Structures are given as C-alpha cells and as structure tokens.
Amino acid sequence: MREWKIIDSTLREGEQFEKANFSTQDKVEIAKALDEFGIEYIEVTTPVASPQSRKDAEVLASLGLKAKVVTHIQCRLDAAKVAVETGVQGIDLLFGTGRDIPRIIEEAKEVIAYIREAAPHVEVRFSAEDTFRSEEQDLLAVYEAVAPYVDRVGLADTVGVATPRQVYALVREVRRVVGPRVDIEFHGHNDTGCAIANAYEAIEAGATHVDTTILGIGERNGITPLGGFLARMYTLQPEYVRRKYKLEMLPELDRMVARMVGVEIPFNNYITGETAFSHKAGMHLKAIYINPEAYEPYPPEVFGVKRKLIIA
Amino acid sequence: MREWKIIDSTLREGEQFEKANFSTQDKVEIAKALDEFGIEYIEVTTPVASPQSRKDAEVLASLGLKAKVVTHIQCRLDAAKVAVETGVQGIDLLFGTGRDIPRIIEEAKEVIAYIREAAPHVEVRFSAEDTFRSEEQDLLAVYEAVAPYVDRVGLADTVGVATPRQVYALVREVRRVVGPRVDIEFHGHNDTGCAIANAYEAIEAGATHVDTTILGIGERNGITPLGGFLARMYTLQPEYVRRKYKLEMLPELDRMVARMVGVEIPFNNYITGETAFSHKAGMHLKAIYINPEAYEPYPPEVFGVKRKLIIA
Ligand SMILES: O=C(O)CCC(=O)C(=O)O
Numbered sequence A, B: 001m002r003e004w005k006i007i008d009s010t011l012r013e014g015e016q017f018e019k020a021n022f023s024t025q026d027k028v029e030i031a032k033a034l035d036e037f038g039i040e041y042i043e044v045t046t047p048v049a050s051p052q053s054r055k056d057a058e059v060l061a062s063l064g065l066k067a068k069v070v071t072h073i074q075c076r077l078d079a080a081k082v083a084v085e086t087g088v089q090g091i092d093l094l095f096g097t098g099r100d101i102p103r104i105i106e107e108a109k110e111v112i113a114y115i116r117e118a119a120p121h122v123e124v125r126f127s128a129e130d131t132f133r134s135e136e137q138d139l140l141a142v143y144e145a146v147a148p149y150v151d152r153v154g155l156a157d158t159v160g161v162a163t164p165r166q167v168y169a170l171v172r173e174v175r176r177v178v179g180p181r182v183d184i185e186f187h188g189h190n191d192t193g194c195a196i197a198n199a200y201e202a203i204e205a206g207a208t209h210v211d212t213t214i215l216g217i218g219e220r221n222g223i224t225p226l227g228g229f230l231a232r233m234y235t236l237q238p239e240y241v242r243r244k245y246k247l248e249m250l251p252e253l254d255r256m257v258a259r260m261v262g263v264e265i266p267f268n269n270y271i272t273g274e275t276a277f278s279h280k281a282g283m284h285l286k287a288i289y290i291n292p293e294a295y296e297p298y299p300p301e302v303f304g305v306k307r308k309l310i311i312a
C-alpha cells in the first residue's frame, strides 16, 4: 500500500470532450453508475460556466451518492462563493498559468480561507496548472506554503508531455515538502501516450488520488482512461482493485459513455475493445489451451468480458 | 543522443492482429510506404508459417527498399535455414519460454553460428521471450554469453505488464553486461497502457531500437503504435524526429492500415484521431488565439493534420 483513490472527471474534464453534450439526466445516470462501481470522487464542471452547469452541480451534489461530489474552479474568490453555495463536498482549485511568489501564496490562501470560513466541512484541493513545466523551486515554494491549509494538492500534466520518471521525481519532491498528511492528486493528459504510465508512477512516488474519465474522454485526446488505469493497477494489486470496485461493470460504463458522446469504443481499447483478448499465433493458442494465463495479463471474466481464439 | 531506430513489425506482429489478412500486394504497399516514410527496419512473419509467408518474405526482402527487411523466427536450426534462404537482411531470433543455462547458451549459439556460417552478412538479433518476468540472474547470464556473437539483443514485454521503471532498470542492466557495441531492441505490448512509455524509458536506459506497428495492431490490444511513439519522441527530440521521418505521411499510414484490417481509427488516436487536436474550454480557446502552442504538445501541421476549435 500503495493506497489510492480515483477522482472521476467524466462530468468535468469529460465535458470538454469535443462531442460531449451531457443533459442533466445523462450526468445523473453517469454519476449513479460510477457510484455503483465504487468510484470515490466525482468531479463536475465549475458552476460559474453557465446557469445549467450550476444546476447540474447542485443536483449532482445532492443525489445522496456515497462518492464525494466535487467541483473544479479557477482559484478566485467569486468562483469560490458560487462553488460553496452548490453544496458540493469538495472544491478542486486550479491556479491558472514573472510574478512574485509571496503574492501567489497570498492570493491562494485568501480563496482557501474564504472556503474554510464559509464551509468548514468542504474538502479543498489546490493545483497549479501545467505543474511539470513550472519552474520547480517556485512551484515547491507555493505548494509548501499552501499545503498546511488544504486537504490535497494536485499536479497536472496539462499539455500531456510529462515523462514517467519526471512525474515520479516531482511527486516525490512534492510529498517531501507537503509532508505525509496532505493528499496528492495526479491529472494527466494523453497527448504522448503516457497518461496511464504517469498515473502509475505518481502513485509509486506517493500520490493518493488519480483523475480518470471513462474512455479517457476530455480536451484533445483526453486523460487517463478508467479502464486502462484499472488494467494497469489490477496486474499490480489485484486483491485491492477487485475489492474496491465492481470491475465487471466496466463494459457497461464504457458503452454508456461511448453511446452518449457518439463514438465507437476503439478496436484496441483496454479490456473492452473488440480486440483486447484476441489470440492468433499458433504458439500462443497452444499455451492458452493448457493455461490462458500464459498470454493474458488479467482474466477477461474479472472485467465481464471473454477471450477470442483465432484458430483459422 | 539518444540515438535510436524503429523496427516496424506491421508485417509480423501486425499479422497476428485478429482482423489482419494481408495479401502479398497489401504487404508490398505497406512496406513501400514505410520505406518512403523512412522506417529503418521492416520485420516480417517467419517463412516457416506457410508457403505464402515464405513467398512474402522472399518478395519483401528483394523489393530493393532502403529499409532492412528482417524476419522473426523461433531460435531453431531448421527455421534458421529457411530464414537465410529467403534473402532477408536480418534475422530476429526469439528463444521461447527449470532447464540449465549453459545448455540454453549452447542451443542459442548453435543457431547463431549456423547463420554466420551460411550468411555472414545477415544481421542477427537474439531475444528471450517474456524478458521482464524471467529470473534476472539467469537472463543476464544468457544475454552476456550470447551478445558477443550477435548484432543486437532484444527485450520483450510479451504479456504487456512491465512497468516503466522496471523497463528502465532492466535495459540499463542489459546494457551493462552486453557493452556499448551490441544494440538493444525493445518490444512492448499495450495491455496495461504502458507500451509507449516503456519504449521511451527503454531508450533513456540505452535501447537503440524500438518495435512499432501502425495503429499498434498486433496480438490482443497490440504493441507500441507508430504514431503515438512518434508523438512521444517528437516532443523530446523534435529536430531528430523531423529529420528522420516524413512525419506528414502519418495520416496516410494510419488510414491505409485501418482500411486493410477493417477498423476505424480510434476517436482519440494519437495525432490522427478525430479528436487529437480539438479544443473546447473557454480559457484554452482564449490562449490558442494568441498562441496555439499554449495548449498543444506539438503542431498539427508537422504531422499533416489540423486543429479544431469548439467555440460553440
Ligand atoms: O485541476 C487540475 O489538476 C487539472 C486541470 C486540467 O484539466 C488540466 O490542467 O489539464
């Protein structure tokens, strides 16, 4: 342990997906299914975006889910006011990208102090945008000063270019300065194919929370996908992962979102793709007959799917 | 540098894709386009598989490509004989997965010695299957003893479960025992979402050759995809990558293979997916107007595609 939780962002980052147009009912359906699956947090679009985004946050936060519903806002006093009024259980602050550090620290602590005052039970996370490309002394100076006032700090690979040893190194340094009590969240884009690998390295370095979306939908090619992330963690912590989540629901989660946003599940999609458990080579087929574990990273039945043998 | 080459395996690993059924002409088309693109090696199915696979290897090796054509066989004398007779420029040996090490070394060196004798100009690579899960002392003992007799050794994450720091560590240890002259190849499956990240870590650790396939097609959910790998390497070595390959051909490569194997390019596919350069968030759109580099990991025009702004 290696203890960690997932923050699903399908109703925040996922809304930024090109073809996403979630009705209030779509969002409630998604949130209930995630809650059934056992997701620990559900993050939703800032209530400042539109009157409908506000309403959606208000409903989602009041559904009586076991998952904590949290909203994502700019690190500003005016947004924070709207946020607390929605009744969310958490607020995820993003400090957006030659300006002095004490001031940045002062600005952040002001917003955070407002929240503690207006709603002492709401969990507060603070992230700086584009965390891995920020100059590191100043980044750590800000995180060190803000951490005693927040429940969680986050790191965001905003443009999807962080590398895995880079993520590992910077998460370790953050954990050093913020200490053991403060949680650590990782959000990573998939532009260079490293979202799942980077989330895994973040956890190895001490991160406690990983952002995912169903099918990885999000801005551009999106972020760490739920299924791919669970495949990665299952092979390392099968007992933990199987206990935490209803893994056999993964195909229904992926189908639901694919249907709503108007895409096909990629042919090679982790676990649920057409091809994820297809075997063809003679020597592979030979071994799978004695033991399918021979060429399978995890059992298809765990995730509610089946293998295919191409003996043709 | 950070010098490296790509071994495309679309005509070997890619043939193991569930829906692959390449005619001889499909393979020639693919090989010529890869050669135009500037791929350094093209790996093809063992000639032992069928009379048609033999013929295909014979044709491909004789196309007069600038790329070296190499075939992939079991580490056996009988296969090696068929292999040399095809005229390929390289042979990629795979030693397939409580049996003693001197014997394994003897068996391998016998096959390798046959090749040197029968065809001294053919490049020989040796890999042990499932390299990252093999007990490491014995694995290094075999690689150390075989390396002086081969041009290249390879490591294969056969079941797609290696982790990035694991790949980095084992490539470094292999480089230690084989020395600087012997090349090092990485082949990684994508079952846990780490194929691109693991190939990148392999190169950082000293690997010189990475196996890819177009769209990552292959057994199960396949291997490191060409486009995703190039996106990852471009952000780190833009000058090198742009000089090495005709990057604007990537959409045609992905389209060609998707058409042949009967799949759609995934909606979120690296670079060439419907969604790879779609922007939606207001603050993102705001910044992209001043500078698209603000939320883009690489320029779409480099790879012959265009961005999308969802201002709606
Ligand atoms: O608040 C965060 O950590 C993530 C914000 C975001 O979507 C990004 O920077 O990519």
Ligand SMILES: O=C(O)CCC(=O)C(=O)O
Pocket: B013, B072, B092, B093, B094, B127, B129, B130, B154, B155, B156, B157, B158, B159, B187, B189
């Ligand atoms: O020869 C190799 O390195 C790769 C063989 C293969 O496809 C695998 O082990 O996954």
Ligand SMILES: [Cu+2]
Pocket: A013, A158, A187, A189, A218, A219, A223
């Ligand atoms: Cu994001």
Ligand SMILES: [Cu+2]
Pocket: B013, B158, B187, B189, B218, B219, B223
């Ligand atoms: Cu393979």
